[PDB]
Subunit: 251 residues, 3 copies
Amino acid sequence: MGVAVFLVYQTITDFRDKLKHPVMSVSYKEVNMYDAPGIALYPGKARLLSCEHHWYDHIPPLKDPGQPGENTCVTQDISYIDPYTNKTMKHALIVQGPRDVRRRELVFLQFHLNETKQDFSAIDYLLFSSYEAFLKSHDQVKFMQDCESSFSSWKFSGGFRTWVKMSLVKTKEEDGSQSVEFRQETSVVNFIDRRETPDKGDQLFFVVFEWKDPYIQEIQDIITANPWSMIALLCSVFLVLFKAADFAKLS
Amino acid sequence: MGVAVFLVYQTITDFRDKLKHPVMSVSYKEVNMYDAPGIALYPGKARLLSCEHHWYDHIPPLKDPGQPGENTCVTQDISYIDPYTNKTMKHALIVQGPRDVRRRELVFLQFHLNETKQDFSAIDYLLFSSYEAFLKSHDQVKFMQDCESSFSSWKFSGGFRTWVKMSLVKTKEEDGSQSVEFRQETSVVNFIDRRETPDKGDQLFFVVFEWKDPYIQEIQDIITANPWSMIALLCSVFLVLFKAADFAKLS
Amino acid sequence: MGVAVFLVYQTITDFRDKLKHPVMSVSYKEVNMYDAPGIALYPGKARLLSCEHHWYDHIPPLKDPGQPGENTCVTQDISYIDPYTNKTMKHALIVQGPRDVRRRELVFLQFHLNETKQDFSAIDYLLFSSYEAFLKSHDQVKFMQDCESSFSSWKFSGGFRTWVKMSLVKTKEEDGSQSVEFRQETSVVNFIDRRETPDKGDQLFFVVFEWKDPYIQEIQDIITANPWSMIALLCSVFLVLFKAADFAKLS
């Protein structure tokens, strides 16, 4: 009897320990064509020059800095308002990201910034999951607000390329909903300004966005214990101790 | 009987496999106000100019390059000794970290040094868990030594800002103790020299420390199996096979 | 009877849910001496100047750039062919990595590149597991193609140092094989050109490779459920329900 009560006490405490915190598992999934995200860039003073997509070409052809044109980009720019303060004005320009990963597709963005007083020049940017959901559905102006309140924005360095290789992670929370977040790693490459005339000193920006790997990481949180197993086990131990008592009575 | 012995062999092998290596789980938690950490710096010859804390103001006001002043930073500088070799004398400068996470308080630092024969510009730094533990408690001079031998130090570049976003990860080892480590990612933004445009070419540094997200990740290693469940299951299989043998005898 | 059928329904559904996706666990391991790995380089037109190993010296001695010599490096330079397109010929350079981890040996490389038409100067590089596997075993010319179609190559910026701290992550899949992949984070330090100050403006590169920590992270995917436990549990529940039926008959 004392053995039974100690066993049931330890079992119930173990079940409490198991239920108070779950376990986490990871998984991967391959996509034939990535859903094209949207990269949000705050031009601010800066003016775009050329947004180009390189679907399969290994090398970007040699360019001529300082001139606009060659805009083959799906762009949508509307002035907005920051919901974090609601009294400040934020302005953005939205583009469509790289689609196919099998053939490396990189979007190449040239940015020229006019002369400014600020010592450290950089342009902020932000990424959200998909572009078509922001383009067509209703009430997406507030979608930008909640996306920026949820997603995080990190500015890229102003002066040289920041080759951005992004990735997608889908965590499956158990309350009937899904969460998507973007993980990216950047690679800065110094640029030679000798070809351009740097006597003016006006900063020129360059950004390249790419898909790191076709696979997307899926993370699931698993509950490790169920009441049915414990109740069956304790019933079995009760039965076996009853059988032992019956044997002792037979003795 | 043979079924019983094979089942017990398989179960004991499974239990040994479960016991030899555990399974990890992750957890998060919110904090109202982060504990003020400490940032350890090794300026060398680079005497600093201005350490300022920006509780909510988004942007540091433009800083005149070179001229000192505006020290609103809790700092202390004491010459130390390296425990790794014990014959090399190294000096460190210690500051307190940012605290306000909801207002994302950031610390702004600056450095200046006359040109030397180092051929490069970089200042090493190191982070430990808290400042009040280094200040008030007894025998913290050796706390520097064992924290340095435990923590890892990475130098920041010299000539442009290195925006550091740090987060604290707490892993709960099972032997009645706890471990704290810092995970950080840096962001470098180029700095324009044309403002001062001097002929001396003296290096100027800029560092910004910040908290990434309020969430603290907790990692615990959980053992997947316990002997009580396995012993109860083997007792149950013994009982059911005994009942089958009794039924066969009745037959 | 209905209780039994619903319980087995829930049990079989839970077992299917456990079977479809397993759980993942992580582990660490110390090594007395890391195996010497191999670093792949694609200099192209940039003939290197000096490859040096700093077995224990914390500090690299002051150098005089612009002139070749002092090649104390285990190098193997060959011309290859890209299997991705199979009509492109690319040249590679192969060196051995650092070995000593307790003394944290670091490898120093200097590259000089003549002025090029490309507006952004960078040298791509790739990492594979070991050097003696490429050098001594048979048909490793195709091992280069295998590794470059398997491993990922990331270019380093040209003009300033890119201090690379690599680490080895060894995951072991369940179908009788293991996977080794390298995770690295770079640390760029600005390089001062005031020492030479030429009017040619030719590029100079510097790379330093070093092990991050002696620990090797090992990842195993663990199956969480096995048929023996659930079949024994359902047999036990069937037996106890049969006992309940016998008791009801007795009543």
